[PDB]
Design an enzyme around this catalytic site. Structure first.
Site, short mmCIF file in Angstrom:
data_model
loop_
_atom_site.label_atom_id
_atom_site.label_comp_id
_atom_site.label_asym_id
_atom_site.label_seq_id
_atom_site.Cartn_x
_atom_site.Cartn_y
_atom_site.Cartn_z
CG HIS A 65 0.46 6.09 -0.83
ND1 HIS A 65 -0.87 6.45 -1.37
CD2 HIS A 65 0.33 5.50 0.41
CE1 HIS A 65 -1.76 6.37 -0.24
NE2 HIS A 65 -1.11 5.60 0.78
CE1 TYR B 148 -3.45 11.09 2.80
CE2 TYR B 148 -3.37 9.85 0.84
CZ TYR B 148 -3.44 10.05 2.22
OH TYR B 148 -3.71 8.82 2.95
CG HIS C 73 -6.98 6.63 5.56
ND1 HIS C 73 -6.52 7.95 5.80
CD2 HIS C 73 -6.23 5.87 5.19
CE1 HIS C 73 -5.08 7.84 5.70
NE2 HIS C 73 -4.73 6.64 5.19
CG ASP D 107 -8.91 10.50 6.64
OD1 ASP D 107 -7.90 10.33 6.81
OD2 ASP D 107 -9.86 9.43 6.36
CD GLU E 203 -4.94 -8.94 5.97
OE1 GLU E 203 -5.68 -7.96 6.05
OE2 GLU E 203 -4.01 -9.61 5.53
CD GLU F 271 -5.21 6.14 1.85
OE1 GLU F 271 -3.97 6.45 1.83
OE2 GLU F 271 -5.30 4.75 2.32
CG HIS G 83 -1.85 1.22 1.59
ND1 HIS G 83 -3.17 1.33 1.35
CD2 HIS G 83 -1.60 2.48 1.95
CE1 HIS G 83 -3.54 2.43 1.73
NE2 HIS G 83 -2.59 3.08 1.98
CD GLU G 84 1.80 3.92 3.77
OE1 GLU G 84 2.05 4.78 3.06
OE2 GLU G 84 0.54 4.09 4.22
CA LIG Z 1 -6.27 -8.62 14.88
CA LIG Z 2 -4.88 -8.16 3.62
CA LIG Z 3 -3.91 -11.53 4.67
ZN LIG Z 4 -2.13 5.19 2.13
#
Ligand SMILES: [Ca+2]
Ligand SMILES: [Ca+2]
Ligand SMILES: [Ca+2]
Ligand SMILES: [Zn+2]
Ligand SMILES: [Ca+2]
Length: 316
Positions: free
Chosen positions: A146, A157, A231, A226, A190, A166, A142-143
């Site tokens: 960017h 942004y 986000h 935000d 997660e 995002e 993800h980062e």
């Molecule tokens: Ca957790």
């Molecule tokens: Ca994931």
């Molecule tokens: Ca996963």
């Molecule tokens: Zn981000």
């Protein structure tokens, strides 16, 4: 640094053993010479001065607890590099094999990771809300995505362009996750979120609403927090992306799934050829339709699925 390429071994944040590309010059450094102009990982030593010092280890074994976030930041940068090169023919984030630099052990109990314009920065979490954030390949990708955006479309942004920004990061973050094929899902973070609670995450693409995020345009957030909800309103695009890939019926609108690789190709093309710094959601839809047209033809299922998906989330 100048030296010779070697291969070290260690354990990541989740206790998994992996090999890593290092560089020997008196010490062994987290410097991977096998990808582009190098992948370099640094120790911020619990402070906020960046990038800190290039990671040096005496024996090329990285099994200490303190080592684990470095191991994963380094390793998952390489996986992300591989994804973009092998799947999209893109060489590092600037398309010209820029060096990928990352710092870990940033600050104290820092519940976040980010791209600061020049490099990756990872906190260790406070251990309750987060464990070291480089533990999450989707977070890492993800980062890093960017950086890709910043060098392509350059989506501002804030507000809708910011939420697209995002979403693009959550989309490729997820596709990298799938690419690596380790417990892949359509949730974000997660693997490093709330170690005391199973089954949760920061966000969900397949059902943004699970964590209070909108899954339809009419539910968008329009306040100032935000950066205008970047986000939050990302949920609407993430939902559309999920639907294009996996399909489903959302608020009565049926979407036939075309699969992750085509989602990836359509959104990569959109990001690199049609989107601009101020693109709004409606402009994203058009870029996406135009990209699927390019790739599959005006009459393709693919184009139809894209329109269905945006219809389903109220974006015209
Ligand atoms: Ca957790
Ligand atoms: Ca994931
Ligand atoms: Ca996963
Ligand atoms: Zn981000
Ligand atoms: Ca060591």
């Amino acid at each position: 640094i100048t030296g010779t390429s070697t291969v070290g071994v260690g354990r990541g944040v989740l206790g998994d053993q992996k090999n890593i590309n290092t560089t020997y010059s008196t010490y062994y450094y987290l410097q991977d010479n096998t990808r582009g102009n190098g992948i370099f990982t640094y120790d911020a030593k619990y402070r906020t001065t960046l990038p800190g010092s290039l990671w040096a280890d005496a024996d090329n074994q990285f099994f200490a607890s303190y080592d684990a976030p470095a191991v994963d930041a380094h390793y998952y940068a390489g996986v992300t590099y591989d994804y973009y090169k092998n799947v999209h023919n893109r060489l590092s984030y600037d398309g010209n094999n820029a060096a990928i630099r990352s710092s870990v052990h940033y600050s104290q109990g820092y519940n976040n990771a980010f791209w600061n314009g020049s490099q990756m920065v990872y906190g260790d979490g406070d251990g309750q809300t987060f464990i070291p954030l480089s533990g999450g390949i989707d977070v890492v990708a993800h980062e890093l995505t960017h950086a890709v955006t910043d060098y392509t479309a350059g989506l501002i942004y804030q507000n809708e362009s910011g939420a697209i920004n995002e979403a693009i990061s959550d989309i490729f973050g997820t596709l990298v996750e799938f690419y690596a094929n380790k417990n892949p899902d359509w949730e974000i973070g997660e693997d490093v979120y709330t170690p005391g609670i199973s089954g949760d995450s920061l966000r969900s693409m397949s059902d943004p609403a699970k964590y209070g995020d909108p899954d339809h345009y009419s539910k968008r957030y329009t306040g100032t927090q935000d950066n205008g909800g970047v986000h939050i309103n990302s949920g609407i695009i993430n939902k559309a992306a999920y639907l294009i890939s996996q399909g489903g019926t959302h608020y009565g609108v049926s979407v036939v799934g075309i699969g992750r690789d085509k989602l990836g190709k359509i959104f990569y093309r959109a990001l690199t050829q049609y989107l601009t710094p101020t693109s709004n959601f409606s402009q994203l839809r058009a870029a996406a339709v135009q990209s699927a047209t390019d790739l599959y033809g005006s009459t393709s299922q693919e184009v139809a699925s894209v329109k269905q998906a945006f219809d389903a989330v109220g974006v015209k």
